[PDB]
Design a protein around this nucleic acid. Structure first.
Ligand code: MN
Ligand code: MN
Ligand code: MN
Ligand code: NA
Ligand code: NA
Ligand code: NA
Length: 318
DNA sequence: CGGCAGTACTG
DNA sequence: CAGTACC
DNA sequence: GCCG
């Protein structure tokens, strides 16, 4: 509806993001989405001010693109931004690493490969640079989840395994697979990793490990046969009591969780991947009270306790 | 003026 | 700890 | 960057 406006703003948002100004990048991001969801084409400064997420400064910017057809600030983005974006698209390298490499004279991934000191994670991200920028067909996400489930249920058939992320939101393609594991007995879930990961690495399924935590694993897998790409895989294990909140957080979207956290704050509660907590004490900064974990056996309970109508995963793709 | 989320890893 | 990543 |  307003792609002539948003396309110019996305350049700025990206530039701010890779340069480290995360809060400005956040503001642009929210305004950009408010633009798409709006009912009609923006046409007035006062109209711009009408929408939540667009303030004076960006009303001006939208006001400028309206008349002349382009943005004055776009012509003054530093020449380093494309290189910073190139570097920060390496998994494990963020804005701080990208800017240091740029300062030290690196300008290409060839420079990085030949002359850069890289962490174990960054070497893996570099090796899979192209693969990790590709989304996968959701039917491939299914094969990966069932691969993990078969290996987990081989140890204990009681284990519950669910792919969340964009997959659970019903999207046709996925950037990764987020697999959540628990057990109804409330104790069978612990210590599962050691045996499960070694099993999945028994297949050649797991190809690289990025993070091997006590509760979270992030790595790389590849299904068998020709024409297969390396895919990002996350495996999270949670106690059954935190299943609902974990289900909700890892299903997303990130903007949806962001909106849920703000709503919770207006009601003196907090919402994390572990629990919905009440009677939280804030000075708007959490201060004189963590609070009590409210019981949430289902995602429906989280919505209910927040006074919201339940939304199934597909309507959370914000 | 200052929050805009917390949580877990890595080294 | 700073940095990065997860939704 | 926005907003209270
Ligand atoms: Mn995901
Ligand atoms: Mn993921
Ligand atoms: Mn590959
Ligand atoms: Na507004
Ligand atoms: Na990165
Ligand atoms: Na050199």
């Amino acid at each position: 509806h307003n792609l002539h406006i948003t396309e110019k703003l996305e350049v700025l948002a990206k530039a701010y993001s890779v340069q480290g100004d995360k809060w400005r990048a956040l503001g642009y991001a929210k305004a950009i989405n408010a633009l798409k969801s709006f009912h009609k084409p923006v046409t007035s400064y006062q109209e711009a001010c009408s929408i939540p997420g667009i303030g004076k400064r960006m009303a001006e910017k939208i006001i400028e693109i309206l008349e002349s057809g382009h943005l004055r600030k776009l012509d003054h983005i530093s020449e380093s931004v494309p290189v910073l974006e190139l570097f920060s698209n390496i998994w494990g390298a963020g804005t701080k690493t990208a800017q240091m490499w740029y300062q030290q004279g690196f300008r290409s991934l060839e420079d990085i490969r030949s002359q850069a000191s890289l962490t174990t994670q960054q070497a893996i991200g570099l090796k899979h640079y192209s693969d990790f920028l590709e989304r996968m067909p959701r039917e491939e996400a299914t094969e990966i989840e069932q691969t993990v489930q078969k290996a987990a249920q081989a140890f204990n058939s009681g284990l519950l395994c669910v792919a969340c992320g964009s997959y659970r939101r019903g999207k046709a393609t996925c950037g990764d697979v987020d697999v959540l594991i628990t057990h109804p007995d409330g104790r069978s879930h612990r210590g599962i990793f050691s045996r499960l990961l070694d099993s999945l690495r028994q297949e050649g399924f797991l190809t690289d490990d990025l993070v091997k935590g006590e509760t979270k694993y992030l790595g790389v897998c590849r299904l068998p046969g020709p024409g297969r790409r390396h895919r990002r895989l996350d495996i999270i294990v949670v106690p059954y009591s935190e299943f609902a909140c974990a289900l909700l957080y890892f299903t997303g979207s990130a903007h949806f969780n962001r909106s849920m956290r703000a709503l919770a704050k207006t009601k003196g509660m907090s919402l994390s991947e572990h629990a919905l907590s009440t009677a939280v004490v804030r000075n708007h900064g959490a201060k004189v009270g963590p609070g009590r974990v409210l019981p949430t056996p289902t995602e429906k309970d989280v919505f209910r306790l927040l006074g919201l109508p339940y939304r199934e995963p597909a309507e959370r793709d914000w």
